[PDB]
């Protein structure tokens, strides 16, 4: 009955699978959730870890997947671009919102960049965390500390949309 | 003598609510000066960024502020966008320190960490963890390690200490 306001969502996520099967479930559920909403996927190009799970899910479901990789390291369209900065820029340019699954330093750096850009008014695209089994709880508490100490405004804290499942998170992103 | 010619300091463009964070910014500024280290920073004169760069300049060391596109002390470098800015800050620096800050400080810190993890540089990366300000962030990285997303080896990229003196001491390594 309602049309999603997103054509494409950019998903940042671990190149590792993680220790808990809940992580892998969440990556598949996110893929299936995008498919159910007629949203295509933009991602950083893995076939391994959670990156491989969300992309394969979206592909299997019949939607299009765009993976964007630096031209050095070599389902769906593969785009190889000059460098890591051009990769992030292209991922951002072609997406209408951003979702982070659990992941390591790389996922976190990508997520913090798009949040900062929203804070600076560079873009207005929704940014959400798929907070499976409280993976991001200490990150969220760190942001609370930053709000309490006056380094982040209560409004800028609200840039991060968070939910424990894909269905809930995508609902919150539509707004 | 320091092994570092320049340290890049990431820090809040806000001054924060606690006097301890502002005194840490000054103390770090004075630490760099005392060890003959020059400063690279994100530019401007506001927040902790203003406090560290003023202390370094006033102490007679060189300051380079790298900005995209208040006033910047020392040498000002204006670059095309925020990607070039972070690239330039990393290229021209020998170690990195994050004071307390918000999203911008975190964004910059995490990219430096990722680049070290990817083998792009091996410059020391330090957190000036004033009054446990970064405790929750460190708990998150530990969770990431426990759940298999960051190796115990890559967790060691992050050096932490509660004061400027102790931190620069650990970075010298
Ligand atoms: Mg090293």
Distance from CA of A53 to the nearest CA of B (A): 15
Instruction: Locate breaks in chain B with C to N over 2.5 A; list the residue preceding each.
Output: 69
Best probe of the A interface among B51, B82, B102, by most A CBs < 10 A, is: B102
Going from the C-alpha of A46 to that of each of A38, A82, A90, the distances in angstroms are: 22, 17, 16
Q: How many angstroms separate the CA of residue A106 from the nearest CA in chain B?
A: 6
- Chain A nearest-CA residue for B82: A117
CB atoms within 10 A of CB B137: 25
CA of B124 to the centre of ligand 1 (A): 5
Q: What is the CATH number of the domain that holds A69?
A: 3.40.50.450
Domain region containing A159: 2-175
Q: What residues of chain A lie within 8 A of the CB of B157, using their CB?
A: 105
What DSSP designation does A128 have? Answer: E
Could B18 and A136 be called an inter-chain contact, meaning their C-beta atoms sit closer than 8 Å?
A: no
Pairing of strands B75-79, B125-128: unpaired
Resolution in A: 2.0
- The technique by which this structure was obtained is X-ray
Structural domains counted in chain B = 1
Smallest Cβ–Cβ distance between B107 and the set A112, A136, A152 belongs to A112
Residue in B35, B28, B74 with CA at minimum distance from that of residue B51: B28
CB-nearest to A149 from B16, B87, B146 is B16
């Amino acid at each position: 009955m309602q049309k999603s306001k997103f054509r494409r969502i950019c998903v940042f996520c671990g190149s590792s699978q993680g220790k808990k099967s809940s992580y892998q479930d969440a990556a598949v559920d996110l893929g299936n959730e995008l498919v159910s909403r007629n949203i295509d996927l933009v991602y950083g190009g893995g076939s391994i870890g959670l990156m491989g799970l969300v992309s394969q899910a979206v592909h299997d479901g019949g939607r299009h997947v765009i993976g964007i990789i630096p031209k050095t390291l070599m389902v769906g369209e593969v785009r190889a671009v000059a460098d890591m900065h051009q990769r992030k820029a292209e991922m951002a340019k072609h997406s209408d919102a951003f979702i982070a699954l659990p992941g390591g330093y790389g996922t976190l750096e990508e997520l913090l960049e798009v949040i900062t850009w929203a804070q600076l008014g560079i873009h207005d695209k929704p940014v959400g965390l798929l907070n499976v089994d409280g993976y991001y709880n200490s990150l969220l508490s760190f942001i609370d500390k930053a709000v309490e100490e006056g380094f982040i405004s209560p409004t800028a804290r609200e840039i991060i949309v968070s939910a424990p499942t894909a269905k809930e998170l995508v609902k919150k992103l539509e707004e």
